[PDB]
Design a protein around this ligand. Structure first.
Ligand SMILES: Nc1nc2c(ncn2[C@@H]2O[C@H](COP(=O)(O)OP(=O)(O)NP(=O)(O)O)[C@@H](O)[C@H]2O)c(=O)[nH]1
Ligand SMILES: Nc1nc2c(ncn2[C@@H]2O[C@H](COP(=O)(O)OP(=O)(O)NP(=O)(O)O)[C@@H](O)[C@H]2O)c(=O)[nH]1
Ligand SMILES: [Mg+2]
Length: 414
């Protein structure tokens, strides 16, 4: 048997709209990540999707077919049990250009990524470029490029695109990144991809001793109709632990918290609660470490967690000292061009009074630029952000021709 453990690594799945990210996650894990009505009706990813799988290897078999996602080797001709390697998880991002901020939110949770490039579309499409640049900015450098949809192009065309992909990464941080051709739809060459994930997206070192911090990307009311009273539960908060660890019965707080009035002014009240349970996927645990998307059960009224109400928050231990800032100072750099537009325009300098979008951790917030200098801006936010360490990465977006466009990045200075 294989053990039941939490996932130990998060692999992002990024790329231009409809290039096959969600189908690829399904090919690997058997799970369709889209859970929302609107996603099903439109046939697109809107919210971050999530799926897990065990990975193992049949030691008697040849690679790549030796790599399996279930405890059997019968497919590669062996009656032996495969050796368990690890449990992995996927953060499935939307490709739509209007949803870049959601991709950025998910990128804060990634330990590595797969950039899916469709073989039957011109290269490089706008969000192929934009997601690639975002990975580079955020530092998600453990990348595999997957050439998807090879089932609907000639061998010659796939080879031509392969060479353009290699030329694209030439002279960049991604120069040595592998390209693995697959058909997500027909589940072709997925075993090579699993092998590639093992080789190129190793589980990173974790720091379990720093103060526990979880970035929140989901929150839920888990109470379903037809449930008996003693099975009702408090609100559940989902996210990824980026450092430290959490345990059942720990006193925690959600930051910034709830928007309230205090002394005639808007304020955020930290939400104090206790961990009632911990789950990854369909499995309960007594503690949670980095890796995977954890569901933290609390004693909160479910009306407070319902419908991703807490998306963008962080969770820490109750006694942790964490800056919650309405005004932030950013040491910034700008990209030279707007990479996500169909025509890559030059990026204009930041000016005072601009409204910018700031991605910090899993949060997305609009703010007004109150000061501009050569390398520093100050921004007054519409909602405060929890800043759990010095020099946290932020990504800066500007509204250009009706779309929010990534234009730069920086470090939040505290
Ligand atoms: N021929 C072919 N079609 C594929 C392949 N993979 C996905 N598709 C098709 O491409 C379409 C989009 O797939 P989907 O997985 O939803 O793409 P996505 O990149 O997740 N889209 P989004 O950016 O909105 O999340 C679907 O019709 C799907 O069946 C493939 O390998 N071959
Ligand atoms: N900590 C904790 N997490 C829970 C509990 N029940 C469900 N969850 C988690 O909360 C999230 C939402 O689960 P749920 O509302 O049941 O929806 P679902 O089962 O994922 N999908 P669907 O409702 O379509 O079947 C999941 O991550 C699930 O694992 C619980 O008692 N404790
Ligand atoms: Mg998708």
């Amino acid at each position: 048997a294989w053990p039941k453990v939490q996932p130990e690594v998060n692999i992002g799945v990024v790329g231009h709209v409809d290039h096959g990210k969600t189908t690829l996650v399904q090919a690997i894990t058997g799970i369709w990540t889209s859970k929302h009505s609107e996603e099903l009706k439109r046939g697109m990813t809107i919210k971050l999707g999530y799926a897990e799988t065990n990975i193992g290897v049949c030691e008697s078999c040849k690679k790549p077919e030796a790599y399996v996602t279930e405890p059997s080797c019968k497919s590669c001709g062996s009656d032996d049990e495969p050796k368990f390697l690890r449990r992995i998880s996927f953060i499935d991002a939307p490709g739509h250009e209007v949803l870049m901020a959601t991709m950025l939110s998910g990128a804060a949770l990634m330990d590595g990524a797969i950039l899916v490039v469709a073989a039957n579309e011109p290269f490089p499409q706008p969000q192929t470029r934009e997601h690639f640049v975002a990975l580079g900015i955020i530092g998600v450098k453990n990348l595999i490029i997957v050439q998807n949809k090879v089932d609907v192009v000639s061998k010659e065309e796939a080879l031509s695109q392969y060479r353009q992909i290699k030329q694209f990464t030439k002279g960049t941080w991604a120069e040595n990144v592998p390209i693995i051709p697959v058909s997500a739809l027909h589940k072709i060459n997925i075993d090579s991809l699993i092998e590639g994930i093992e080789e190129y997206i190793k589980t990173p070192y974790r720091d379990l001793s720093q103060k526990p911090v979880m970035l929140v990307i989901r929150s839920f009311d888990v109470n379903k109709p037809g449930t008996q009273f003693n099975e009702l539960k408090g609100g559940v908060i989902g996210g990824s632990i980026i450092q430290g660890l959490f345990k059942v019965d720990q006193e925690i707080k959600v930051l910034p918290g709830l928007r309230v009035e205090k002394q005639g002014k808007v304020s955020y009240e930290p939400i104090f609660t206790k961990i009632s349970s911990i789950r990854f996927g369909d499995e309960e645990f007594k503690e949670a470490k980095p890796g995977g998307l954890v569901a933290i059960g609390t004693y909160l009224d479910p009306s407070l967690t319902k419908a991703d109400n807490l998306l963008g928050s962080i969770i820490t231990l109750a006694d942790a000292e964490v800056p919650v800032l309405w005004n932030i100072r950013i040491k910034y750099n700008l990209l030279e061009r707007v990479v996500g537009a169909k025509e890559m325009l030059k990026v204009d300098p930041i000016r005072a009074k601009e409204t910018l979008m700031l991605s910090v951790g899993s949060s997305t917030t609009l703010g007004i630029v109150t000061s501009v200098k050569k390398d520093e801006i100050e921004v007054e936010l519409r909602r405060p952000v929890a800043v759990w360490s010095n020099n946290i990465r932020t990504v800066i977006s500007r509204q250009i021709a009706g779309r929010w466009r990534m234009i730069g990045w920086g470090l939040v200075e505290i």
